[PDB]
Swiss-Prot record, chains A, B, C, D, E, F, G:
Underlying gene: ISU1
Lineage summary: Eukaryota, Fungi, Dikarya, Ascomycota, Saccharomycotina
Official protein name in the record: Iron sulfur cluster assembly protein 1, mitochondrial
Recorded phenotype for the gene knockout or disruption: Cells deleted for both ISU1 and ISU2 have decreased activity of several respiratory enzymes that contain Fe-S clusters. As a result, cells grow poorly on carbon sources requiring respiration and also accumulate abnormally high levels of iron in their mitochondria. Knockdown of ISU1 in ISU2 knockout cells reduces cell growth, decreases cytosolic tRNA thiolation, and increases association between SSQ1 and GRX5.
Miscellaneous remark of the record: Present with 10800 molecules/cell in log phase SD medium.
Outcome after substituting residue 40 to S: In ISU1(LVF/SSS); no growth and abolishes interaction with both JAC1 and NFS1
Part of the intact protein present: 28 to 165 of 165
Protein's job: Scaffold protein for the de novo synthesis of iron-sulfur (Fe-S) clusters within mitochondria, which is required for maturation of both mitochondrial and cytoplasmic [2Fe-2S] and [4Fe-4S] proteins. First, a [2Fe-2S] cluster is transiently assembled on the scaffold proteins ISU1 and ISU2. In a second step, the cluster is released from ISU1/ISU2, transferred to glutaredoxin GRX5, followed by the formation of mitochondrial [2Fe-2S] proteins, the synthesis of [4Fe-4S] clusters and their target-specific insertion into the recipient apoproteins.
TM ranges: none
Main location: mitochondrion
Pathway: Cofactor biosynthesis; iron-sulfur cluster biosynthesis
Region (SSQ1 binding region) location: 109-113
Cofactor info, note text: Binds 1 [2Fe-2S] cluster per subunit. Zn(2+) binding stabilizes the monomeric form.
GO annotation terms (biological process): intracellular iron ion homeostasis; iron-sulfur cluster assembly; tRNA wobble uridine modification
Cofactor(s) required, per the database record: [2Fe-2S] cluster; Zn(2+)
Curated annotation (Swiss-Prot), chains H, I, J, K, L, M, N, O:
Effect in UniProt of substituting residue 80 to A: Impairs cell growth, lowers aconitase activity and strongly decreases interaction with ISU1
Name listed for the protein in its UniProt record: Frataxin homolog, mitochondrial
Top-rank taxon, per record: Eukaryota
Outcome of mutating residue 42 to A: Impairs resistance to iron-catalyzed oxidative stress, no effect on Fe(2+) delivery and cell growth
Organism: Saccharomyces cerevisiae (strain ATCC 204508 / S288c) (Baker's yeast)
Substitution effect: residue 79 to A: Impairs cell growth and lowers aconitase activity
Effect of residue 90 to A: Impairs cell growth and lowers aconitase activity
Encoding gene, per UniProt annotation: YFH1
Amino acid sequence: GSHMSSITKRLYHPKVIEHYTHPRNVGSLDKKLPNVGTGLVGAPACGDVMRLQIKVNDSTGVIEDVKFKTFGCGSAIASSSYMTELVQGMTLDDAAKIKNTEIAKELSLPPVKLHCSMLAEDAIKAAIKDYKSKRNTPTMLS
Amino acid sequence: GSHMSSITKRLYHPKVIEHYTHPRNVGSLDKKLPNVGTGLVGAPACGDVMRLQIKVNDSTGVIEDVKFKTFGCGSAIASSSYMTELVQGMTLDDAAKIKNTEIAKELSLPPVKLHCSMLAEDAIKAAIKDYKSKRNTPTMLS
Amino acid sequence: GSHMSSITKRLYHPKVIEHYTHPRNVGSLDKKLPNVGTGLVGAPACGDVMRLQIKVNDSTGVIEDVKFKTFGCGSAIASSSYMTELVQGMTLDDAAKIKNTEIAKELSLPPVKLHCSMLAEDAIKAAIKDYKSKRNTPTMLS
Amino acid sequence: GSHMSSITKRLYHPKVIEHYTHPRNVGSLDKKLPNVGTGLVGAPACGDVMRLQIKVNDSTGVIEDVKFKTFGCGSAIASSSYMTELVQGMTLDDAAKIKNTEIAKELSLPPVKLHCSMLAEDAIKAAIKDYKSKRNTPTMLS
Amino acid sequence: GSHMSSITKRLYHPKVIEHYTHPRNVGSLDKKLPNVGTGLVGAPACGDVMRLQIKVNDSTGVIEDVKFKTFGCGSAIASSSYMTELVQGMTLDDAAKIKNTEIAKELSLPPVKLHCSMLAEDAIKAAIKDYKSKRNTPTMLS
Amino acid sequence: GSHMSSITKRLYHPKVIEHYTHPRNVGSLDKKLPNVGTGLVGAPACGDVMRLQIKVNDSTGVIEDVKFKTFGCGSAIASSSYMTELVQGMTLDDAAKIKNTEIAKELSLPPVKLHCSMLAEDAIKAAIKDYKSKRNTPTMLS
Amino acid sequence: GSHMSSITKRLYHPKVIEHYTHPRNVGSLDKKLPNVGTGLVGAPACGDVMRLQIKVNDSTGVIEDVKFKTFGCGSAIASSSYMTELVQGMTLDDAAKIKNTEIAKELSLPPVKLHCSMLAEDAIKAAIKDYKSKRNTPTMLS
Amino acid sequence: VESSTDGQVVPQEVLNLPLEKAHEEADDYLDHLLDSLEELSEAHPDCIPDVELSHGVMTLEIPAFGTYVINKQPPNKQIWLASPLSGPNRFDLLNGEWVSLRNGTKLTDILTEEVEKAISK
Amino acid sequence: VESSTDGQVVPQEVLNLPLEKAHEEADDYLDHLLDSLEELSEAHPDCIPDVELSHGVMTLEIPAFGTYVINKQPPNKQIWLASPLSGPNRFDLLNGEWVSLRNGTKLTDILTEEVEKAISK
Amino acid sequence: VESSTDGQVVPQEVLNLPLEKAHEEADDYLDHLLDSLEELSEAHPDCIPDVELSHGVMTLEIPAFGTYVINKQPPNKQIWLASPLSGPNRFDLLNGEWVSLRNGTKLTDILTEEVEKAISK
Amino acid sequence: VESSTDGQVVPQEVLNLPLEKAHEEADDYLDHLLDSLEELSEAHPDCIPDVELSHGVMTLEIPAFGTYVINKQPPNKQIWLASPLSGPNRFDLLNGEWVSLRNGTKLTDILTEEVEKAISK
Amino acid sequence: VESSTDGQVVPQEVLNLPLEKAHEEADDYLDHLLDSLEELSEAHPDCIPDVELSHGVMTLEIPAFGTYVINKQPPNKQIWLASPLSGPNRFDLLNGEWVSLRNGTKLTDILTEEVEKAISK
Amino acid sequence: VESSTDGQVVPQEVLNLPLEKAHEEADDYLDHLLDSLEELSEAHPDCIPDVELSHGVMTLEIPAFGTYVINKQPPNKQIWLASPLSGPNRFDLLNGEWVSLRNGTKLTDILTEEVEKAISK
Amino acid sequence: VESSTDGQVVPQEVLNLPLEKAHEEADDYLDHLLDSLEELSEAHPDCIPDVELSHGVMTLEIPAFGTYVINKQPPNKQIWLASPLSGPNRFDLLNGEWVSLRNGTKLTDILTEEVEKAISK
Amino acid sequence: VESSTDGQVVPQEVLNLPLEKAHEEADDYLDHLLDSLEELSEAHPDCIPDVELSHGVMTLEIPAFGTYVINKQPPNKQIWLASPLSGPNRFDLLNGEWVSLRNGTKLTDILTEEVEKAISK
């Protein structure tokens, strides 16, 4: 991150623009036997399974596109959006970076018990650590 | 804590809306031998009489409704609103989270003394200390 | 507290005055389903019962009256008379504010036996360990 | 704990004997304003429903009996048994000791795995803290 | 400091003797365009008025006589007595020693409230600070 | 200053408006042997002369009217406005706060000593110290 | 420092206004045996030259104007504008002030080496390390 | 009651009996107070401009209302408070809320209700 | 009521409700700790008139009926106490009262009772 | 309650009056927090393997179903905890027993149940 | 003055007589020293930015028209202020507000005046 | 008083003119106020609390009513005292009397009033 | 980067190839952690108006959700981290970036997202 | 990761995907590093007679079939190890799990294999 | 001029003649650096991360790109400065600006540039 700085940044939000870019749940990846992770997580209290499939270049390692789905709770859409903005245009040493902590205090309220609609980073931690296994790089997995 | 989040939230003031929604000076409570307090207080010198009667559920221990009466001072109306917004819809942990200096330094210009223009913290504390003795729990009473 | 102040309170003994006010084993209370305590203790050494039943207002949380009884031991009469001076006209946070060790070394004169003449405070720790349960708040009981 | 002491302890538990003492889930209670708690919990992802209803002597502050139901999971049967065993013949404060991580990590096995196959504690914390709310004391609850 | 010497200074209270010497409300003062203050207190619920008029010599600067009145509660008589004992025989600097706290711990019985007979400090600080504006020396005023 | 809060001080100050509202070249004062001061300060070559006169009530001691004039520099009109806000509503002690350095380096801009356009504080320090000799209170003047 | 006070001064581009003031690549200077520096630096990445030439008074030692040429990158032009804001209207101790690390991390995202666009301050460091010598004082250089 | 999740408990199994709030953990109840203020003090240009938040000190910044600096008293006890008009207070944890040893009040919303009263006047 | 002053409230005809007992809280129940060592005793016809105040160690002197010794515990917990007939204790405030936090028996009103029961035995 | 009585009850007037729990004031809580870890600790053909006792530390040991390791908090406050699934806790005594700053839980009898729940599976 | 009362200056017979104001008195000069000092710090696109209290070090920041950062005096006294236009300034309250221990000027509203005298010019 | 000639003065030509009380400051303050509180002391049935001077700092007994334990403020200032209702103050001299720095009130003979109004009510 | 090359002495042929940011020197990472985190964390009427700067701690300060405080472990190991949302994290580096040792995860530009998700919710 | 979730990452739409073995940190070393240094110590007449940990340290105490003592090294390094047949290592965690920085080995399962290879022979 | 005179050199007859003044030298002006960036701070729409004063020692930084922490060199010299793009270096006064001991550069007016060039790009 770097100060450009946009002063109209706050008024808008990247998440809508990111959603707009791909019609519809389409991404970009390279094809070889080492292949992209496929990731989902289900919270029964959220009532939906959030599907975060990374589509990653295999010759630069850079995540070109990672798409999300969300259903049920309307509070988990925002969480999944911010788990695709952050890791796009980043490597897998900057997408193995991401923490659950990011979205684990944004629907706060008191997060005495971790809300289900903050489990949208587990969707992509079942994709990028299911990437490390299928890409043939696990150790950061463990 | 709390969020909405909206930039127009503070444009309006919550207190007038809250007072307006409820119609008028009637709450919900359970009926049993332990019973809800009453919160009479009066100052004939400064002319302000109030009455913060809590109406509290006795089977959940959650303040459902509490309303104020404000006579005399016209600038004490909106200082009796913090003893009918934090308390309403919240627990008996939120019964005591107020001060008399919370609402008596604002008109001020802090002097040596204070002012008895608003006595709304005292009013609900004549009712939650009458609901620690009628409720039958004197642990935090004194 | 409130005092004259003069040492005339030490010229006459307070216990006599206390005994005089409402003899014997009669008080004032609020009649409701969570009922006032019953305070008893017994020693088979001198075959005596000390009865310190508290009769408590159940809407202000103040002990209106507690009247002692003492049998056998003639030096235990004075021992049970200061478990009635303090707790009357005061809260239930001031009812439990006294230890048995308060009265169990006042005839000391370090001996080998503390006798069954100083068991009085265990008769009002049988009254508040019966009242706080009935009152329905054993928070300060245990 | 308590120095009973069993030096002949192997792999048996008297928890089963305790549960039977009175057929589930009925026990004994006093009748007045502190009406006993009813506690339920369910898992939609493990299928286990556990119903823990304490039955308490209101005038002594001591839980006479509590028994459990267990459906779904067979490993949640053991979890409920300890919670019920511990708190009989004991004070409400002695039933506020228990932690959900008493039964949560004592199932299986690394901190990585956690299941909904043990929610027994939650159900008795919807019965001992739903009791406190009806008992008109919130000072042991919070 | 104080010498007689006897211990009968507490046997008979100072206040009676002070009142007896030069009653009331008359005093002694010099005449010039700078002129003595007049102090009052109010409240009709309590009913209190404490008319503290200093009469101050302008050739020594010493308060020769400051006499009190009391209306309302009979406990404000005593309060204003020691506000007419410490301030006499001294200048305006050392007649501003007085703290409300002097007389506000003596009708206590500590409360979180304050009485209308804990105002005798303010009674004579409506006279000596009305003689730091009319004496044209606001140095000691603030 | 005070809480309002006013963040609309944007090229606006109500000080000029306040001077306009009250007269100029007299104010409020009481006729008695203590009498109001008069202030002057001037630089002949620069041609700037500011006549700040306090007209002070001699029975409350509070400056209710503070006159200002400015001649010569037009950047000194602004300087005089700060000797016509703070001083009002206060006694001499709370109107002797200001320093020459308060306004002097707020004129400009380059290091250490500035110009001589401002003289505003000096003008009213020839007026309040000529009301500490005519008011008859030496101690403040030194 | 800087006082106007306007904080919307840098909301709009400074550089445009600065460029607008002196049309076009003509500055003001004096000439004697000391004579103005000449300063260029290549950048064949852009395929062009950034030529920063100070035009300096030789009787006051104040940089009257500094005149610059920039081609190629549109961000290179705005890296040669802050080496012409600060230095103008100030001495040669403000021409020795400037750092080459000032403009070399503004585009970035702090790098470890200057980019082609960044090298603007290298052309004014080819203008002060040639002017100092010609001016006959290499003292400030080192 | 400690877990790592909310959900897979009470899925409408019981819903007619609610339950009083949990308090996990000790220093999480210093985050709840923070949270309330940002849409009860800011996101508007009217009135109150800032509430400073410092490192190892939590402050409340209101112009004339007064400021509250949360202090610590000498090691033996933790957290000290001094109000601009209420006098000295001290706070010790109960079940994980910070509870005053005065009237049993909690500063979770004492220093949140002054903040939105700033907006009013 | 954390102001600890609240004049022109309840002139006593609009009360008829429980009245809160003072909280200051740093020294409020050090005026309830003793309440008969300036209101009673000292040069009275009965025994034990001695009183001592250090700089925060103040107790009634009643050796026969047993004295308490106010001490401070090593940094981690505040205050240390010693009782002859029940061993050492650890004390902290609860609402302003000076009490062990393991029980509800204060030493606050114990020393009030024992000075005027020293007349009897 | 620091009654310090060694009986002098049971003639059946106080044996029809409930007696809950009388405070330690420091001793009892430590006990029973190790009296199932000194009665099922080891030395049986089946039971938990071992609990190692330590000086100035106290633990429960179970092979992998986790435990609560008791520690101390730096001077200002006392007690510190770490566990495999309960995370960090601290504790204060304020309900007559060791009160968790998570939700008020007391660990005196939790360890007792975990020992024989590690005998279950 | 140590009136320390809630109201009871308002019955209107002493509301027309003079009495002390703004002396409550140990935190008063951090409420009238910050009265509108930090009020103009944000929530305008004009005015003046960033003027704020740090960890309890109150400062004055203005673009280039002066500086005041509170300082301490050399040992045997505390609290010092400095002006580049009059050098050494010594401070400590004397009978109320801040009063120089150098002479008798007060910085109580000097800081506030200069925030908005940097908007005038 | 730096004249130090009290006795050789006042024979009716300066005894009809006002003369201020002597100040040393410290010796005089100890001579006067400490034994003005001892004149009240024991040998009467009108009760007393006694006078104390624990480490050369006045620590006058105020057991039943109020807390006015006088202490010294840490280096760079003298005297730390705290009123139980109007808050703390710092005491320094101004004319040989001890006059507060935050409100300009003394305590020179107020303590004498306190003791003998604690037995009037 | 060790090379100290981020060329223009290249036609950017080298650049096309995957190349990842690396911080050199040891002051560089400060302007990549607080460059990204503080960028929307000061003055606007949309929320969040100020950040504090301190000695020995340099983190984001947002009073919208609480904060993370970077601590330091006693000499034997450098840096520490703790959160009441994920326990005592513990801290060092491994790529010249801030690398928490919980799982090797960075937090260089993660907390950036919680400044612009303070607007969203 | 940095988690705070262990529940609702298991209903079998993410546990049909590999659910990785996490290592972290103050929640996975306390008993999962002590999973055989007390498991096969006691509660049986068979096995190996002992492996026991120290008080405030952990040690492997297999009778003469090697040993491990966790050691420390002077400040600049935290924690150290030694192995009989290869000299001293150095031990530090970096991903939660302890890892030698001398060659890369984790002693998580070194002290598990050896324990039951000593039952074998 | 080193007599601190810059008045009476300004009526124009010597103001035209070259004179240079900007010297602080330290004690004694901070308007040329600390709060030269206060104008360029935050109130207005442009994003700036910090200018805010710390604990009373100037440690001026721009956490965006220009971290140049103002520090003191260890005793025997004064002033130390950091740089993100060229590492730390020692610095000392030469004319009351903080001057590079490498060859002389002054960050006095440079950091002023960087703040308003960090919103331009």
